[PDB]
């Protein structure tokens, strides 16, 4: 029913109203208890990224990209694991790479609980600018594949 209307994500559905959440398909009064706390408990984290010496970087020098992970909602409980047996705490991969060359530049795992910091350095080879892409990928939830493309040198 969602493919035959034009809606595919949960960000395509959570931007509706409560009646519009219920006027899409079927409903029952325990569904509104669990789906709403599911939407309460998934990661609502957006980005902040930072590069030093954008023009003033040359060949050889190690360069940083710093990521603050702006979480905009409170963490009350672990991940929703209705079919997974263990009580797991959520992790993160602040990972950067090459969208064309398929070259994994860097990656750091992350546990935050609120807006925290992650610095990651690497080395860029010669002949100028290299167009990197930053991904934010979790081990527990969909809908947060934030990739942001940029370039250095």
UniProtKB/Swiss-Prot annotation:
Q: Where in the cell is it found?
A: Nucleus
Q: Which residues form the signal peptide?
A: none
Which tissues and organs express this gene's product? Answer: Widely expressed.
User: Which residues are annotated as modified residue Phosphoserine in the UniProt record?
Assistant: 30
| UniProt remark on domains | Contains two helicase domains. The N-terminal helicase domain has catalytic activity by itself, contrary to the C-terminal helicase domain that may have a regulatory role and enhance the activity of the first helicase domain.
Biological role stated in the UniProt entry? Catalyzes the ATP-dependent unwinding of U4/U6 RNA duplices, an essential step in the assembly of a catalytically active spliceosome. Plays a role in pre-mRNA splicing as a core component of precatalytic, catalytic and postcatalytic spliceosomal complexes. As a component of the minor spliceosome, involved in the splicing of U12-type introns in pre-mRNAs. Involved in spliceosome assembly, activation and disassembly. Mediates changes in the dynamic network of RNA-RNA interactions in the spliceosome.
What do we know about how this protein assembles, alone or with others?
Answer: Component of a core complex containing at least PRPF8, SNRNP200, EFTUD2 and SNRNP40. Component of the U5 snRNP and U4/U6-U5 tri-snRNP complexes, building blocks of the spliceosome. Component of the U4/U6-U5 tri-snRNP complex composed of the U4, U6 and U5 snRNAs and at least PRPF3, PRPF4, PRPF6, PRPF8, PRPF31, SNRNP200, TXNL4A, SNRNP40, DDX23, CD2BP2, PPIH, SNU13, EFTUD2, SART1 and USP39. Component of precatalytic, catalytic and postcatalytic spliceosomal complexes. Component of the minor spliceosome, which splices U12-type introns.
Which family, according to the similarity comment?
Answer: Belongs to the helicase family. SKI2 subfamily.
User: What disease involvement is noted?
Assistant: Retinitis pigmentosa 33: A retinal dystrophy belonging to the group of pigmentary retinopathies. Retinitis pigmentosa is characterized by retinal pigment deposits visible on fundus examination and primary loss of rod photoreceptor cells followed by secondary loss of cone photoreceptors. Patients typically have night vision blindness and loss of midperipheral visual field. As their condition progresses, they lose their far peripheral visual field and eventually central vision as well.
| Protein name from the UniProt record | U5 small nuclear ribonucleoprotein 200 kDa helicase
Residues included from the entire protein: 1973 to 2125 of 2136
């Amino acid at each position: 029913r969602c493919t035959d209307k034009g809606v595919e994500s949960v960000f395509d559905i959570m931007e509706m109203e409560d009646e519009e959440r219920n006027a899409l398909l079927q409903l029952t009064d325990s569904q509104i208890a669990d789906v709403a706390r599911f939407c309460n408990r998934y990661p609502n984290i957006e980005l902040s990224y930072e590069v030093v010496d954008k023009d003033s970087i040359r060949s050889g020098g190690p360069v940083v990209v710093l990521v603050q992970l702006e979480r905009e909602e409170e963490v009350t409980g672990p991940v929703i694991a209705p079919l997974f047996p263990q009580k797991r705490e959520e992790g993160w991969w602040v990972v950067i790479g090459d969208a064309k060359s398929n070259s994994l530049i860097s990656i750091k795992r992350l546990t935050l609980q609120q807006k925290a910091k992650v610095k990651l350095d690497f080395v860029a080879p010669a002949t100028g600018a290299h167009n990197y892409t930053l991904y934010f990928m979790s081990d527990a939830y969909m809908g947060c594949d934030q990739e942001y493309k940029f370039s250095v040198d």
